[PDB]
Design a protein around this ligand. Structure first.
Ligand SMILES: CC(=O)OCC1=C(C(=O)O)N2C(=O)[C@@H](NC(=O)CCC[C@@H]([NH3+])C(=O)O)[C@H]2SC1
Ligand SMILES: [Zn+2]
Ligand SMILES: [Zn+2]
Ligand SMILES: [Zn+2]
Length: 159
């Protein structure tokens, strides 16, 4: 499964905004967004974040991520981790997270990556655990129906 990466471009937005397949998936990767997702909502996140990057395989954009927090010499916080529905479980998020870790180290001199994952997203919790992230705290948040959820705040030292 050969993959490459590059900064996200305007032309990618419609593709990436196609990735979340339901309100749960949108909530897990962008909890401030409102279903249905849209290019305007994706562009607004890009404009206020840093490091928006796509993963590409065989001419297809298959993954997207960015940083929603960045503190030079300190840490970055990874967000908006989205994978194309036809490419789930094939290593795209693993790949892109590694790219983003290098970007945090190289550009931001980060010592730490933070990832926060909602409790219902088992696939995410297990992936981040496989990649060496450890849970540090649990924060209460609310979902779009007003129901209480647990945000599991994880981190990993970089090198
Ligand atoms: C890994 C990933 O896609 O995280 C999706 C998350 C994001 C994001 O939008 O990228 N986050 C935020 O922004 C912050 N929001 C709240 O805590 C509310 C965290 S909650 C986790
Ligand atoms: Zn690169
Ligand atoms: Zn292929
Ligand atoms: Zn509350």
């Amino acid at each position: 499964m050969q993959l490459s990466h590059r900064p996200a471009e305007t032309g990618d937005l419609e593709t990436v905004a196609g990735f979340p397949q339901d309100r749960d998936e949108l909530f897990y990767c962008y909890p401030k967004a409102i279903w249905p997702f849209s290019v305007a909502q994706l562009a607004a996140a890009i404009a206020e974040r840093r490091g928006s990057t796509v993963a590409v395989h065989d001419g297809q954009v298959l993954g997207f991520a960015n940083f929603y927090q960045w503190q030079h010499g300190d840490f970055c916080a990874l967000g908006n981790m989205m994978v194309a529905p036809a490419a789930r479980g094939l290593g795209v998020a693993r790949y892109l997270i590694g790219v983003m870790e290098n970007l945090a180290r190289e550009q931001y001199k980060a010592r730490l990556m933070k990832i926060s994952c909602f409790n219902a997203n088992a696939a995410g919790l297990l992936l981040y655990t496989q990649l060496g992230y450890q849970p540090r705290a649990i924060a209460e948040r609310h979902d779009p129906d007003g129901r209480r959820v647990a945000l599991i705040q994880m981190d990993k030292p970089l090198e």
